[PDB]
Amino acid sequence: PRRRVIGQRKILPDPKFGSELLAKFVNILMVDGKKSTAESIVYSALETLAQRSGKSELEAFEVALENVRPTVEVKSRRVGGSTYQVPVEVRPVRRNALAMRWIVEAARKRGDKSMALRLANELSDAAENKGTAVKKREDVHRMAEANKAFA
Amino acid sequence: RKQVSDGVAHIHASFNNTIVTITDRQGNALGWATAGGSGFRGSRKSTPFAAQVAAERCADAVKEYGIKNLEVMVKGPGPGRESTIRALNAAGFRITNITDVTPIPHNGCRPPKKRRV
Amino acid sequence: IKVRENEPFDVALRRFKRSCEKAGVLAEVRRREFYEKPTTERKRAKASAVK
RNA sequence: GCUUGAGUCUCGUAGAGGGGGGUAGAAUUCCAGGUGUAGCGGUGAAAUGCGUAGAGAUCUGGAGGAAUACCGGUGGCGAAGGCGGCCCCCUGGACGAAGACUGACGCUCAGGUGCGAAAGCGUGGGGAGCAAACAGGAUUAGAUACCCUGGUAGUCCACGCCGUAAACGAUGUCGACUUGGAGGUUGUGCCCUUGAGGCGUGGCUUCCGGAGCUAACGCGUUAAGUCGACCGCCUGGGGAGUACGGCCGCAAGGUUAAAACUCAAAUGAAUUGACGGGGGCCCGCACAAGCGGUGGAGCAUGUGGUUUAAUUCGAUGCAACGCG
């Protein structure tokens, strides 16, 4: 990244719904190279999400993830010998990457039984935008809203 | 109240703070707003953003007068001033004149020493 | 110093103050009376203006 | 005696040359008043400070002091220090054009005399801004500083003193000769002035360079080149431009000016490198963007230490510490 501008590698889409978005979601959730376990958790959790909300699968996922995507985020500069937290507009791939990282991280924070219930309840708490990942999004937006004076 | 319908926006941009005072053509102030009185104390009260929200807030608080035309008089240098007049024609004012009235001495008083920072 | 315009106007476009007052003249009169640094600042300004 | 040195006269030119007097416009501060309202100011961030007893902002009127934006220019003038609005008065010098006059009247100069930034001193005024001292706030390990908020002498005027500066082109004065180029500034002559031209001829000045010189760097017709006249000064570093004495000074101090002792160097310019909280360009899981660890727990293993009869020896920033 000093010199090398890069490409990006193409991920295989989801084997049940053909969604590369949800494929990157099972990669964000995966730990220790265990992909089967993570896709089992995602299929169970989103299956009970589709059963609970009654909408469908990945539009319930797409709504619950649409409520947690950040708009702008702070970022350090260190240009004039000072520490500024400037607000900067998030790229779309980074936008939903941060969305999924906050959903998954907040779901690991929860205190329910199984991971499919922690993440199904976290996506359900994000569908009416009252969970923890929405507090992370509102927190990011308070930081970039307080420091709006730098652009 | 009193229904003046034309005023002057004296904007006083300095390096640390911009202070916008909307008055009439006689010179009697009708309401003011500073960048430091709009939140963002400190390194953030001298920015174009702070000056524009100062000017938005000074456009409010003169609704009681029905000002439509105004001249703009600009003092001092500053990160403000330019953005400041923008905020004024983002607030429905018909901006008539833009004069820059920075006080320049004709080699008058001795300026202070300073700044071996 | 003044500007005005009739109803075809959109932008400020007052670059009369990148002509005279703002950039140099007020930032110059913020700091010390020398007699000494200006003689050398002007000496090296006119010694830099060379081909 | 003579005119090619020096000087006088005639006519103009440019100029922040000097001294005295007056005036003008912007701006800062203060005072009085109107509007108006919650901050202003300040900083890297803050706080001290000012502010609902109404600040800051804004308008009107007044007072006062200092300095004189733009023009403004390696532009000008002055012996040097230095001199910057505009106007008047008194006054010094320079330069140019043609002609006339005197006729070597010249050059330098120890002692001597004068002028001599700034700070400082004396007496009397003045005092807006700025600001040693000083005070407070910060910063910091400390901060008798840098930064912030105030702030007295001083800076300004009159007269006297001081008598120095990196008072520097670190280059004494006067004169003569020795290839060039580009400018600036101020005169003057000639030619269709056929315009903001062309050709010369002086004065002052800036940059670059030739020969030559120079340790080199550089100087280079304004010499640090080639010569002549007279003056000043130098003789290793420190001690020391100090002590004692003299002269000067109100004082601060100034000037003239040693020795003992001590070192074998001190110095100049340039070269190679290294370094820089100098500059430009560029790279690496270097940072950033992420994911997983270590430091916490138990154990394994190595080391330091301690113990021991011995706890064999070696490895110890990175690049020793389950290493030999």
Phi, psi (rounded to 5 degrees) for B35: -70, -30
Cβ–Cβ under 8 Å, residues B31 and B22: yes
Q: How far is CA B6 from the centre of its chain?
A: 16
Q: Does B2 touch chain C (CB under 8 A)?
A: no
Cross-chain residue pair B99–C16, CB shorter than 8 Å: no
Query: Exposed, middle or buried, A120 (CB in 10 Å: 0-12/13-18/19+)?
Result: buried
Nucleotide nearest to A81 (CA to C1'): D44
Å resolution of this model? Answer: 4.5
Phi, psi (rounded to 5 degrees) for A131: -75, -150
Q: Which 14-43 residues of chain A touch chain B by CB within 8 A?
A: none
At residue B100, the 3 state secondary structure works out as strand
Please name the member of C12, C25, C27 whose beta carbon is closest to the beta carbon of B85: C12
Cβ–Cβ under 8 Å, residues A100 and A109: no
Alpha carbons C14 and C5: distance in angstroms, whole number: 11
Residues of A in contact with B40 (CB under 8 A): 149
Alpha carbons B95 and B28: distance in angstroms, whole number: 19
Which pair of tokens denotes residue A58? 């990945």
What Cα–Cα distance (Å) separates residue A144 from each residue in A56, A89, B103?
34, 10, 37
Alpha carbons B53 and B56: distance in angstroms, whole number: 5
Q: How far is CA C48 from the centre of its chain?
A: 19
CB atoms within 10 A of CB A43: 18
Report the structure determination method: cryo-EM
In terms of CA atoms, which chain C residue is nearest residue B77? C22
Q: Which 78-107 residues of chain B touch chain C by CB within 8 A?
A: 82, 85-86, 96-102, 104-105
Q: Does B50 touch chain A (CB under 8 A)?
A: yes
Q: Which 64-93 residues of chain A touch chain B by CB within 8 A?
A: 82
- In this complex, how many residue pairs, one in chain A and one in chain B, have their CB atoms less than 8 Å apart? 11
- In this complex, how many residue pairs, one in chain B and one in chain C, have their CB atoms less than 8 Å apart? 47
Which pair of tokens denotes residue A6? 């890069």
Residues of B in contact with C17 (CB under 8 A): 100
Of A32, A31, A8, the closest CA to residue A20 belongs to A8
At residue B74, the 3 state secondary structure works out as strand
Interatomic CA–C1' length for residue A86 and nucleotide D34, angstroms: 45
Alpha carbons A89 and A112: distance in angstroms, whole number: 35
| Element of type H or E holding B13 | strand B6-13
Distance from CA of A149 to the nearest CA of B (A): 5
At residue A65, the 3 state secondary structure works out as helix
Cβ–Cβ under 8 Å, residues A42 and A107: no
Alpha carbons B38 and B40: distance in angstroms, whole number: 6
CA dihedral C29, C34, C40, C45 (to 10 degrees): 10
DSSP string, A55-66: S-SHHHHHHHHH
Q: Which nucleotides of D are covered by protein (CB under 7 A)?
A: 25-28, 34-46, 55-60, 65-70, 73-75, 128-131, 146-148, 207, 282-288, 290-292
Alpha carbons A93 and A83: distance in angstroms, whole number: 27
Phi, psi (rounded to 5 degrees) for A45: -70, -45
Distance from CA of B43 to the nearest CA of A (A): 10
Nucleotide nearest to A82 (CA to C1'): D44
